[PDB]
């Protein structure tokens, strides 16, 4: 079998899940448009009752200039004018753990 679910059996599985989520449906028919309007009013769902979305839309100068001038030829501070993930330390810890485990074997 290899995998938990075989792709060729996916649809069947899905079908069964649906049977367990919606055991009851509203199957009684209506005789005219007024009854359909009433039924649509009665079966409204909050998650599907939003309004349509909105349309897409589009002195300190001297101090800033002096600051920019004073940051000339700066490798890192100039670029800015910061999320530490500690990747290197975690890597070092993993390497140390692996080396200690290897040493313990001998």
């Amino acid at each position: 079998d290899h995998m938990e679910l075989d792709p060729k059996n996916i649809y069947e599985v899905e079908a069964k899940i649906l049977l367990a989520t919606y055991p009851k449906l509203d199957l009684e028919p209506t005789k005219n448009a007024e009854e359909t309007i009433a039924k649509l009013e009665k079966l409204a769902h909050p998650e599907h009752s939003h309004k349509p979305p909105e349309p897409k839309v589009r002195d300190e100068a001297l101090a800033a200039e002096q600051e920019r001038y004073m940051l000339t030829l700066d490798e890192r501070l100039s670029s800015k004018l910061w999320e530490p993930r500690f990747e290197r330390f975690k890597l070092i810890e993993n390497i140390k753990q692996e080396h200690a485990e290897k040493k313990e074997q001998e």
Partner: peptide, 7 residues
């Protein structure tokens, strides 16, 4: 056994 998977 699809029944077991669903359960």
């Amino acid at each position: 056994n699809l029944n077991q998977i669903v359960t």
